Scaffold this motif. Structure first.
Motif, PDB file in Angstrom:
ATOM      1  N   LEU A 161       0.892  -1.374  -0.103  1.00 22.99           N
ATOM      2  CA  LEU A 161       0.310   0.266   0.036  1.00 22.99           C
ATOM      3  C   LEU A 161       0.908   1.044  -0.075  1.00 22.99           C
ATOM      4  O   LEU A 161       0.666   2.122  -1.036  1.00 22.99           O
ATOM      5  CB  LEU A 161      -1.081  -0.034   1.249  1.00 22.99           C
ATOM      6  N   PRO A 162       1.966   1.523   0.982  1.00 18.85           N
ATOM      7  CA  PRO A 162       2.591   2.679   0.888  1.00 18.85           C
ATOM      8  C   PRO A 162       3.361   2.951  -0.718  1.00 18.85           C
ATOM      9  O   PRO A 162       4.123   4.178  -0.656  1.00 18.85           O
ATOM     10  CB  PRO A 162       4.121   2.365   2.444  1.00 18.85           C
ATOM     11  N   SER A 163       3.603   1.827  -1.195  1.00 21.55           N
ATOM     12  CA  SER A 163       4.444   1.947  -2.586  1.00 21.55           C
ATOM     13  C   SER A 163       3.293   2.322  -3.374  1.00 21.55           C
ATOM     14  O   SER A 163       3.808   2.989  -4.590  1.00 21.55           O
ATOM     15  CB  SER A 163       4.370   0.915  -2.903  1.00 21.55           C
ATOM     16  N   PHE A 164       2.330   2.439  -3.647  1.00 21.76           N
ATOM     17  CA  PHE A 164       0.782   3.097  -4.405  1.00 21.76           C
ATOM     18  C   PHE A 164       0.270   4.252  -3.200  1.00 21.76           C
ATOM     19  O   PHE A 164      -0.470   4.429  -4.233  1.00 21.76           O
ATOM     20  CB  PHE A 164       0.532   1.402  -4.812  1.00 21.76           C
ATOM     21  N   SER A 165       0.727   5.163  -2.717  1.00 19.02           N
ATOM     22  CA  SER A 165       0.038   6.463  -2.844  1.00 19.02           C
ATOM     23  C   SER A 165      -0.424   7.057  -3.448  1.00 19.02           C
ATOM     24  O   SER A 165       1.649   7.866  -3.809  1.00 19.02           O
ATOM     25  CB  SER A 165       0.762   6.202  -0.670  1.00 19.02           C
ATOM     26  N   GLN A 166      -0.855   8.498  -3.132  1.00 21.59           N
ATOM     27  CA  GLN A 166      -0.743   9.365  -4.181  1.00 21.59           C
ATOM     28  C   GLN A 166       0.925   9.788  -3.924  1.00 21.59           C
ATOM     29  O   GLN A 166       1.658  10.544  -4.525  1.00 21.59           O
ATOM     30  CB  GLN A 166      -1.834  10.892  -3.621  1.00 21.59           C
ATOM     31  N   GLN A 167       1.640   9.853  -2.619  1.00 12.54           N
ATOM     32  CA  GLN A 167       2.503  10.401  -1.753  1.00 12.54           C
ATOM     33  C   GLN A 167       3.563   9.525  -2.379  1.00 12.54           C
ATOM     34  O   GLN A 167       4.804  10.159  -2.532  1.00 12.54           O
ATOM     35  CB  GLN A 167       2.176  10.591  -0.191  1.00 12.54           C
ATOM     36  N   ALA A 168       3.943   8.755  -2.240  1.00 15.29           N
ATOM     37  CA  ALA A 168       4.860   7.363  -3.049  1.00 15.29           C
ATOM     38  C   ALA A 168       4.839   7.768  -4.931  1.00 15.29           C
ATOM     39  O   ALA A 168       6.173   7.916  -5.785  1.00 15.29           O
ATOM     40  CB  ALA A 168       4.777   6.203  -3.158  1.00 15.29           C
ATOM     41  N   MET A 169       3.683   8.511  -5.859  1.00 11.78           N
ATOM     42  CA  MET A 169       3.696   9.092  -6.762  1.00 11.78           C
ATOM     43  C   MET A 169       4.764  10.078  -7.298  1.00 11.78           C
ATOM     44  O   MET A 169       5.799   9.759  -8.294  1.00 11.78           O
ATOM     45  CB  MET A 169       2.558   9.068  -7.258  1.00 11.78           C
TER      46      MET A 169
ATOM     47  N   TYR B 264       5.581  16.981 -10.576  1.00  6.87           N
ATOM     48  CA  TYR B 264       4.641  15.795  -9.877  1.00  6.87           C
ATOM     49  C   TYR B 264       3.639  17.035 -10.170  1.00  6.87           C
ATOM     50  O   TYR B 264       2.038  16.872  -9.171  1.00  6.87           O
ATOM     51  CB  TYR B 264       4.966  15.337  -8.525  1.00  6.87           C
ATOM     52  N   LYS B 265       3.413  18.748  -9.577  1.00  8.50           N
ATOM     53  CA  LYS B 265       2.970  19.542  -8.949  1.00  8.50           C
ATOM     54  C   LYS B 265       2.099  19.504  -9.618  1.00  8.50           C
ATOM     55  O   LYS B 265       0.562  19.898  -9.548  1.00  8.50           O
ATOM     56  CB  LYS B 265       2.931  20.621  -8.815  1.00  8.50           C
ATOM     57  N   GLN B 266       1.789  19.986 -11.249  1.00  4.56           N
ATOM     58  CA  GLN B 266       1.589  20.518 -12.171  1.00  4.56           C
ATOM     59  C   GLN B 266       1.035  18.938 -13.183  1.00  4.56           C
ATOM     60  O   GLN B 266      -0.158  19.396 -13.522  1.00  4.56           O
ATOM     61  CB  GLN B 266       3.000  20.832 -13.088  1.00  4.56           C
ATOM     62  N   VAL B 267       1.200  17.625 -12.986  1.00  6.49           N
ATOM     63  CA  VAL B 267       0.629  16.819 -13.401  1.00  6.49           C
ATOM     64  C   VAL B 267      -0.900  16.585 -12.525  1.00  6.49           C
ATOM     65  O   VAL B 267      -1.561  16.455 -13.107  1.00  6.49           O
ATOM     66  CB  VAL B 267       1.779  15.409 -13.205  1.00  6.49           C
ATOM     67  N   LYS B 268      -0.819  17.089 -11.232  1.00  8.90           N
ATOM     68  CA  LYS B 268      -2.027  17.345 -10.257  1.00  8.90           C
ATOM     69  C   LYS B 268      -2.605  18.364 -10.987  1.00  8.90           C
ATOM     70  O   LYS B 268      -4.357  18.055 -10.252  1.00  8.90           O
ATOM     71  CB  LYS B 268      -0.905  17.246  -9.322  1.00  8.90           C
ATOM     72  N   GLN B 269      -2.356  19.102 -11.290  1.00 14.28           N
ATOM     73  CA  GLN B 269      -2.896  20.219 -11.765  1.00 14.28           C
ATOM     74  C   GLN B 269      -3.875  19.967 -13.364  1.00 14.28           C
ATOM     75  O   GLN B 269      -4.507  20.920 -13.352  1.00 14.28           O
ATOM     76  CB  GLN B 269      -2.691  21.994 -11.566  1.00 14.28           C
TER      77      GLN B 269
ATOM     78  N   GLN C 237      -3.684   5.109  -8.600  1.00 14.37           N
ATOM     79  CA  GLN C 237      -2.842   6.479  -8.646  1.00 14.37           C
ATOM     80  C   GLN C 237      -1.699   6.087  -9.843  1.00 14.37           C
ATOM     81  O   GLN C 237      -1.550   7.544 -10.063  1.00 14.37           O
ATOM     82  CB  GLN C 237      -2.820   6.780  -7.145  1.00 14.37           C
ATOM     83  N   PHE C 238      -1.067   4.900  -9.521  1.00 12.04           N
ATOM     84  CA  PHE C 238      -0.362   4.969 -10.286  1.00 12.04           C
ATOM     85  C   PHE C 238      -0.695   4.474 -11.954  1.00 12.04           C
ATOM     86  O   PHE C 238       0.085   6.153 -12.086  1.00 12.04           O
ATOM     87  CB  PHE C 238       0.784   3.385 -10.628  1.00 12.04           C
ATOM     88  N   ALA C 239      -1.267   4.914 -12.225  1.00  9.06           N
ATOM     89  CA  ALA C 239      -1.862   4.077 -13.201  1.00  9.06           C
ATOM     90  C   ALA C 239      -2.522   6.240 -13.870  1.00  9.06           C
ATOM     91  O   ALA C 239      -2.201   6.200 -14.799  1.00  9.06           O
ATOM     92  CB  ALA C 239      -3.426   3.556 -13.499  1.00  9.06           C
ATOM     93  N   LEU C 240      -3.192   6.575 -13.000  1.00 11.76           N
ATOM     94  CA  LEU C 240      -3.283   7.694 -13.394  1.00 11.76           C
ATOM     95  C   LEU C 240      -2.798   8.660 -13.139  1.00 11.76           C
ATOM     96  O   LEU C 240      -3.130   9.694 -15.056  1.00 11.76           O
ATOM     97  CB  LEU C 240      -4.764   7.972 -12.709  1.00 11.76           C
ATOM     98  N   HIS C 241      -1.539   8.582 -12.485  1.00  7.05           N
ATOM     99  CA  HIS C 241      -0.514   9.709 -12.372  1.00  7.05           C
ATOM    100  C   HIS C 241       0.457   9.606 -14.015  1.00  7.05           C
ATOM    101  O   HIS C 241       0.434  10.525 -14.676  1.00  7.05           O
ATOM    102  CB  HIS C 241       0.561   9.722 -11.966  1.00  7.05           C
ATOM    103  N   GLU C 242       0.603   8.319 -14.169  1.00  6.70           N
ATOM    104  CA  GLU C 242       1.088   7.831 -15.571  1.00  6.70           C
ATOM    105  C   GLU C 242       0.579   8.336 -16.571  1.00  6.70           C
ATOM    106  O   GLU C 242       0.810   9.046 -17.531  1.00  6.70           O
ATOM    107  CB  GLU C 242       1.952   6.334 -15.789  1.00  6.70           C
TER     108      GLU C 242
END
Ligand code: HEM
Ligand code: D0L
Ligand code: SYN
Length: 455
Positions: free
Chosen positions: A104-112, A305-310, A404-409
């Motif tokens: 779980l901690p390997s896949f969190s928004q923070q780990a992204m 990372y911040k920009q991808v979040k926006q 989260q990994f998939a949606l960030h990538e």
């Protein structure tokens, strides 16, 4: 009160099994749902399940106090090489919750934030590939999207470079993966998996399981003898301890997890990106809106990372692509206890359900009459979406740990794609959906016109 549920056509002792004797069985089941409605029985020799297509019923099936994850036949055959990794284990097997707690901690928004740099590495390789195409060459979209997502999970997950953009012909591990996935899926239809016709498939299957185990076990062994402490999934797995049992994963299960993540990387996010680009070229006003966000947000040569979040609209584009074509198109459940579904269909403990996701996402009582339209603005307000109407990542504690990994990538890559290129559906492509583990457009090609924006 008690309703008897319809059932599609049968084939004597083979029951409904021959209906899956096709290369597009999910799409065949969707058409049956059109005919038969929100629920239908489906029998094969030694198996009964019920296909759910309405939000009315699926919202009950997603009640974790009443239904737990079931291994479909598809997942049972994939288990032959994915073992008791996260996706092919039962909730009650000790290695499920243990690996779940550890990972779980390997896949969190923070780990992204830690994976971001290496997803930018692969994403830049994709953009540079397309910048380097000659005029009136074209892009093979699912092919390139699969090169991307496989490389991303390889690098972010295990510090390994598959170097897919340097290749026409897969890395040897991937050859056995893809062949093993193909056998697992084809095995589902065989009325007699024991006929000697399937002896070579059987032979080749076992060779591929061996190629896959031997290469993964080597990577694990090599990392352990190395000491290198790179922030990747393999290190967290070698170092992590389950708070509950206090135990780490053993090397066999770590191998299964790595196989599992590589299957997920290869198969799911690449399909999503392919369907998203297809819908964008078929809906130029949506592409415009998303490209405008990409240009306004991605103001540096490498995204942060911040920009991808926006990239919020890009995110609803992705969600709307997952709505119409959820690339992992079903999941299975079993009744934990006797229970009555929708006040009409009594179930006994052990009874199985199949959730047919593409049909759920076309429930007109939920999405309205423009249900076949590509409108990302559907997702502006999740509070206006009824419970369990949208299930592309599964349900509850057995939902997609890699969501989260998939949606960030996918957000990062589509964002950069829209920043750097105009796209042309130069063939007026007719959507053709190929089914493996997952759904992917087949033969989808486009032309990219560079905006000539430096990286
Ligand atoms: C957009 C892409 C993706 C989609 C649509 C997707 C969808 C799903 C779905 C529907 C399930 C549940 C299957 C079931 O209940 O039988 C699932 C489980 C899972 N997915 Fe994903 N997935 C995606 C990307 C990924 C990625 C990138 C990874 C990791 C690299 C991943 C890892 C997993 C794992 C480990 C499970 C099993 C989790 C558990 O039961 O503990 N997925 N995914
Ligand atoms: C991991 C990605 C999603 C895979 C989901 C399965 C994807 N199947 C691939 C074909 C359609 C779909 C499915 O409905 N399968 C059922 C089929 C089945 C039902 C009843 C008796 C025999 C076999 C199953 O596997 O039991
Ligand atoms: C076997 C791997 C897998 C990964 C994600 C969803 C379903 C299955």
């Amino acid at each position: 009160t008690i309703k008897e549920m319809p059932q599609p056509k049968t084939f004597g002792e083979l029951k409904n099994l021959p209906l899956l004797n096709t290369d597009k069985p999910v799409q065949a089941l969707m058409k049956i749902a059109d005919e038969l409605g929100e629920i239908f029985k489906f029998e094969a020799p030694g198996r009964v399940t019920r296909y759910l297509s309405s939000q009315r019923l699926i919202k009950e099936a997603c009640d974790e106090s009443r239904f737990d994850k079931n291994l479909s036949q598809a997942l049972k055959f994939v288990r032959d090489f994915a073992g008791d990794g996260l996706a092919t284990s039962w909730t009650h097997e000790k290695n499920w919750k243990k690996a779940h707690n550890i990972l779980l901690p390997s896949f969190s928004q923070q780990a992204m934030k830690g994976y971001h740099a290496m997803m930018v590495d692969i994403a830049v390789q994709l953009v540079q590939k397309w910048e380097r195409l000659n005029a009136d060459e074209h892009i093979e979209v699912p092919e390139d999207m699969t090169r991307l997502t496989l490389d991303t999970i390889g690098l972010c997950g295990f510090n390994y470079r598959f170097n897919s953009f340097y290749r026409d012909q897969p890395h040897p591990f991937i050859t056995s993966m893809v062949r093993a996935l193909d056998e697992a899926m084809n095995k589902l239809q065989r009325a007699n998996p024991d006929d000697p016709a399937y002896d070579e498939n059987k032979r080749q299957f076992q060779e591929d399981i061996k190629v896959m185990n031997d290469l993964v076990d080597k990577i694990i062994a090599d990392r352990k003898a190395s000491g290198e402490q790179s922030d990747d999934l393999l290190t967290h797995m070698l170092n992590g301890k389950d708070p509950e049992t206090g135990e780490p994963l053993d090397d066999e299960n770590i191998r299964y997890q790595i196989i599992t993540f590589l299957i997920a990387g290869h198969e799911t996010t690449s399909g999503l990106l392919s369907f998203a680009l297809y819908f964008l070229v078929k809906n130029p006003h949506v592409l415009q809106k998303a490209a405008e966000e990409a240009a306004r947000v991605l103001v540096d040569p490498v995204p942060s990372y911040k920009q991808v979040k926006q990239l919020k609209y890009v995110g609803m584009v992705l969600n709307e692509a997952l709505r119409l074509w959820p690339t992992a198109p079903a999941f299975s459940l079993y009744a934990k206890e006797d229970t009555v579904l929708g006040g009409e269909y009594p179930l006994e403990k052990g009874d199985e359900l199949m959730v047919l996701i593409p049909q759920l996402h076309r429930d007109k009582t939920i999405w309205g009459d423009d249900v076949e339209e590509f409108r990302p603005e559907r997702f502006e307000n999740p509070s206006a979406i009824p419970q369990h109407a949208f299930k592309p990542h599964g349900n509850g504690q057995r939902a997609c740990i890699g969501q989260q990994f998939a949606l960030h990538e996918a957000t990062l890559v589509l964002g950069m794609m829209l920043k750097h290129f105009d796209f042309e559906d130069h063939t007026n492509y007719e959507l053709d959906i190929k089914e493996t583990l997952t759904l992917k457009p087949e033969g989808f090609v486009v032309k990219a016109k560079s905006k000539k924006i430096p990286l």
